[PDB]
Amino acid sequence: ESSKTEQVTGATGITQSTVTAPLPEAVSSLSLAPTVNALDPWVYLNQTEVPGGTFTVSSATQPGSVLLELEISPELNLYTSHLFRMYAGWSGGFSLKLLVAGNAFSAGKLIAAIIPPNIEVPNSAYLLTGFPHEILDFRTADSMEIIAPDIKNIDYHFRGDKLGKLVVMVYSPLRSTSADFEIEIKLTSAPLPDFKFTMLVPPIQNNALPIWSIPQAPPYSMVNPRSPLTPVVELYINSSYATCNHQLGRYTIYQGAIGNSTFNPSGAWTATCTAEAGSVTGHPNWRYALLDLPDNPTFDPTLPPVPRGFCDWGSGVKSGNKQHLVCFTGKKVEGGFQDVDTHMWDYGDNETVGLDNTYQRTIYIKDPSLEKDAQYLVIPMGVSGAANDDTVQVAPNCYGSWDYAPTVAPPLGEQFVWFRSQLPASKTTTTSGVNSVPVNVNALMSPDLMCSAYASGFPLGKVALLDYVLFGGSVVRQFKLYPEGYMTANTTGSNTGFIIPADGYFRFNSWVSPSFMISSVVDLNL
Amino acid sequence: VTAPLPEAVSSLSLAPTVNALDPWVYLNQTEVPGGTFTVSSATQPGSVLLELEISPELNLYTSHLFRMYAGWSGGFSLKLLVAGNAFSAGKLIAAIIPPNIEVPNSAYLLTGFPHEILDFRTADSMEIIAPDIKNIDYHFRGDKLGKLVVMVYSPLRSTSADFEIEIKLTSAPLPDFKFTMLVPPIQNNALPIWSIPQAPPYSMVNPRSPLTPVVELYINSSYATCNHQLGRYTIYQGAIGNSTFNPSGAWTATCTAEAGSVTGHPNWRYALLDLPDNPTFDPTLPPVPRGFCDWGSGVKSGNKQHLVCFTGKKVEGGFQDVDTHMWDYGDNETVGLDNTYQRTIYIKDPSLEKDAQYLVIPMGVSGAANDDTVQVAPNCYGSWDYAPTVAPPLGEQFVWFRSQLPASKTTTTSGVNSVPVNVNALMSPDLMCSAYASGFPLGKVALLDYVLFGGSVVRQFKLYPEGYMTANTTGSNTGFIIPADGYFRFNSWVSPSFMISSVVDLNL
Amino acid sequence: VTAPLPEAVSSLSLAPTVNALDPWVYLNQTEVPGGTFTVSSATQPGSVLLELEISPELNLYTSHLFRMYAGWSGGFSLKLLVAGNAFSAGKLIAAIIPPNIEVPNSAYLLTGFPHEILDFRTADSMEIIAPDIKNIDYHFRGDKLGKLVVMVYSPLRSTSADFEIEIKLTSAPLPDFKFTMLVPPIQNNALPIWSIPQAPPYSMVNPRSPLTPVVELYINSSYATCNHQLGRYTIYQGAIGNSTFNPSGAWTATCTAEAGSVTGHPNWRYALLDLPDNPTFDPTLPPVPRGFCDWGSGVKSGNKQHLVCFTGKKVEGGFQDVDTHMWDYGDNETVGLDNTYQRTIYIKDPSLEKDAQYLVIPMGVSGAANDDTVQVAPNCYGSWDYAPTVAPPLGEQFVWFRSQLPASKTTTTSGVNSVPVNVNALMSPDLMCSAYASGFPLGKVALLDYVLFGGSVVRQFKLYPEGYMTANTTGSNTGFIIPADGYFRFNSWVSPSFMISSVVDLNL
């Protein structure tokens, strides 16, 4: 506990640097582990930036909103995190330094507090004052050092315990004459003396690493799990797409592939069909078919009803009287050979439901020469004669897949990035019926950029800030990748079909919180 | 003999701070919240009569103080009070179960635990020491704790004269009890005491019949179950079935369809109800507007009841030509049996085909409609999440909120006359509202007093976390009435099997 | 530090017991519940910012503890935190008022009490001692207590752009603080923290239009006052005026016709409302049945916009043919009728009898405005306990719950058509029940947060125990909408002079 005051250059203010210990530390004797493992003395003298330990306070920030929330653990931040790969347990507190870029001609106050394990974090500075806390004034604060203790009832920690937290929040709002003034808060940390490790297990967990390295693979060498035969030619942002109900190209951390997705989408995954004789009332040639379903054929209401990865489609509404999908269909299976052509098709049309929700996924193919109990090969993709770029974007409604992929939306102020590609039209000049039209297809994350994430891993409760480098010029853009997971970037303006090349590459930047505001804007005005 | 297991004391070398207690808290015993139960000769052998975690929730003062703290340590001293008489042969066993040990179902095996035996005739409170069995866990919240278990040892063989014995518990912390880590008091837990407002039930709010008062709280021994989808609220999940909170803002509805007809001496015509939630339009979500209506019109008859409804045509700015018609049941036997006419409905009007979208307001019944038909019970099929049917325990009867629906009579060619009727709730949200702020302790039931004339008459009811009120009755009757004069006073927390002392004689 | 009055330490003899606090409550300073302020250049000298009783409620922990105790003493130490700036100038007074002496209303008289002068330049972290003044050994509950009063001495001015100054108080009990025991934890003290269950506004009833759900939460600056009589609830009294606690069931009414007519159009005849409490024997009781919409018709007629009601005639078992009629209130009588709450009404129905009884249900208006013609209640002349007219403080605007009333159109015989309208109300009863259970600190206001889009930056409102909420706005006054899908989570207690930092821009 101490305080230093310094005079600023050209004396018109002061800077305060304080050391405080709101809660006394209870040092454990470590008598139940006579295998105490010592660290490298220099590791105690290197303060490093905390992942997700940066925030900005503007005049619009409310008190009671939680700006920072961090657990006390070896994950603070760089060298104890790397060292906690060879060991099974740990015990000890941390020195946390809070750096504030204040000025003598502003006003306002911060509050920081320590919260024990299994206690909920409130949303009120009034309530935070009931914890062990410290207050800062923006006119004089430079750095505050907090001796954050290790609150535990055990001799030492294994993995999976509940840990205490440091919470930082605005106590009194910021004011200034200039409307563009903001205060940046940053956090660094180091282990206190008496921090120790326990039993040395040089066998390393494959998810035992801080910052991960992304290989330099440009987007143009990637699927595109919704149009595999076509390559990715650009990224693009559109303001009108505030949701995504796709079932393909949905990959997440902690689960792998979700929805009706797979890691091998090569080609518009083919399928086979066979079902009753019967046609749609809207045309006597719109015959019925049922998708052949391996992989738990028995129609369990909990297993997916469509073949894994086949779900290549557009939409979808009863206006389908003038809109259809286009597929290469082989009309019979005959000792391997199949008579193939192109045909129109779509998901079931029974206005009882505006059918995008077929359970067994009944389809029709618009073919009068179709048999009833024969098997027909079906391979997407095409559309005609619809608008139709915006119709392909909206996927068929899904409740057949019981463990289906949920709809997702970006937070206010952000938009998706939508890996984009083009597919052309297959025109016919001889016989009527089958003429498609060109269309662009978008898609969320692809398996290529996620395999590295699966190998490395993500810290619990944090997203990845990545830099997209596209030289030839000297341009770097910033994206936020969530483990749900998908990419967003901080747009400002109205839709212009914003386009970004696909020859750059992704390089890892710091970890951040889901509410982090990117310090880089894309102007959707062009 | 009073301390089969000694108490080990917590060097407390890892606590950042040790917070002391007011010394007088150690010298005063309070009641244990939820420590009340009953025993009779009808109790089944091997039944666990009481199971209690050993935590700061055993005493009013420690439970109040624990909201300010993050960790605790120490055991308790407990006393059992038994209200028997000289003819009560039998014995009780109280035992301490360590964490991670399963409770057996025979007292012969409970004798293997540190325990104490008791006689049902003893007039002196019996003391036991419930220690804090631990390596660390009990310190923080959400950890595994040792238990106290109370069971019958030698069963009540001499109770030919039926008589129910009531057991209570009191507690006090042991001298080594301590707290740690002062924190603000907000922790998400049921209060040991709700404070119910003194609002009378006369508050004219009835979920199944708004716009009518709630006079005449009544009991009927013939209503042994409750299907009902509207007036259903639970303390842990909120509104269930198709309930709102806010039943009146969801009474109206709209519908639309242009189809031919169905047969019944006049001509009717189908309609479909709008679902502004446009839910999954098959099972997994409700098939009718939230809080619309569930009267219950009877069976396939369809020519005798014909629930009534105000109905109007939708046009720009609102609705036109609002008048009374009939709806919906029940002779669409395919759908009348699948009873998803929850969505599909009738109407006694030929014009409404041109009426592509019309407003509906139930407003009453007609024909040969009784109270018993309105009481039950449009069936529910599929898989939404619909409220299950429920019955009271044997010996108890439901207590309802009752309302009177007057009749609407006409003289013109409309020929649509309603009939006076009565409607039951079953439960009103104006009581669960206050129940929600306090909350219920896990596994317990509220015992409420109902004060009527100054205090000269007091009834006693049991309120379950599933949303029912029950009363202990003796006779048989179909129209027992209780006035709505209106104190609901909280008494205590009791076991679900608790037998109420005050009985309601239905033969008067 | 500064101590205007020395603290006289009491030797607690003979308190039956002397109950100590844990040592860690003395060493940490928490926020004072209700001790928050803003000073701006518009605050006038002599304005009383803070008035705070010196009691266990000055600290967050002692007020929680002061619910299982019966007595206490003595004083506190307060710390002043001021969020000032480089350009401001001004001064405050802090004075200690002994009991049972009255607080003066001028700064010239505050000098004379023990006091301290605080300058905005140097009162940045300042310690004051609030003593416990008494002539007894210890306090019981309900005793007269001394006060701390903070008032503006020299107004706030600045040398550059004008900043507001926010001031907060932290407290800790002095080492001589002690309690006196023992009582159950329900002891009439307002809890320092208010826990509001999550309930969106759309799930709340609108007391001035029960059958229509709430859609918003809108603001309009042309409404500087409210004289309504229905949506009025407070903390101390509960429902006031003609208010429930149940808008729905108390909506309909009955009236008795009279032999007479109005001069203007003889086709509409008088009638007297029926009061089941019969407060015509007594002019000190309300002259209108509880409920019964207090709309909302302006100057009388000539352009004869009226109200609209579903009305019918009483017969055995119910009511015969029911239609829509126009009924607002007498035309040009001396009391302002149709601009006064009265038992006397009229209805446009030549077919009305003399001594018959008629059911009335207000449903809409005709020829009127979708705006401030129904926003104004008629009047409350008399000697009964009517609700007073209220206004927000300067710079603040009311927040209303709002609903849309659709129009009823006709084509055949009535020629009576309604107009689509919007109806707004003050507090709904569903947001006050937890408040009633918990209570408000004396003379304090609740600063609440309205959480809107999953936890974004979101609105802040002030809730006044007189039963209404307000917001801080700037700019134009065109009707401003806010969604109705929030939570209303509790933020803190503030003085009524507090000015909200978050501002609503009424320009969009």
Structural class of chain A: mainly beta
Q: Termini of chain A, distance in Å?
A: 55 Å
| Shape summary of chain A | elongated
How many E-type strands of chain A? 30
Gyration radius over CA of chain A: 29 Å
Please give the share of residues in helix of chain A.
Answer: under 10%
Please outline the major beta sheet of chain A.
6 strands, mixed
Measured by DSSP, the beta-strand proportion of chain A falls in 25-35%
Kindly report the greatest chain-chain contact and the residue count on each side.
B-C, 66 and 66 residues
Structure annotation, total helices of chain A: 4
What oligomeric state do these chains adopt? part of a larger assembly
Order of strands across the biggest sheet of chain A?
Answer: 1-2-9-6-11-3
Could you walk me through the main structural features you see in this protein, from its secondary elements to its overall organization?
The first copy, chain A, is mainly β and 526 residues long. The first copy, chain A, has 4 helices and 30 strands. Chain A is elongated and about 90 Å long. Chain A binds chain C through residues 60-65, 104-109, 123-127, 129-130, 132, 135, 137, 139, 172-173, 175, 177, 412, and chain C through 28-31, 33, 60-61, 81, 83-86, 124, 160-161, 163-164, 166, 168, 170, 193, 449, 453, 456-458, 460, 489-493, 501-502. Strand 18 (318-326) of chain B pairs parallel with strand 20 of chain C. Chain A: Pfam families: Calici_coat, Calici_coat_C.
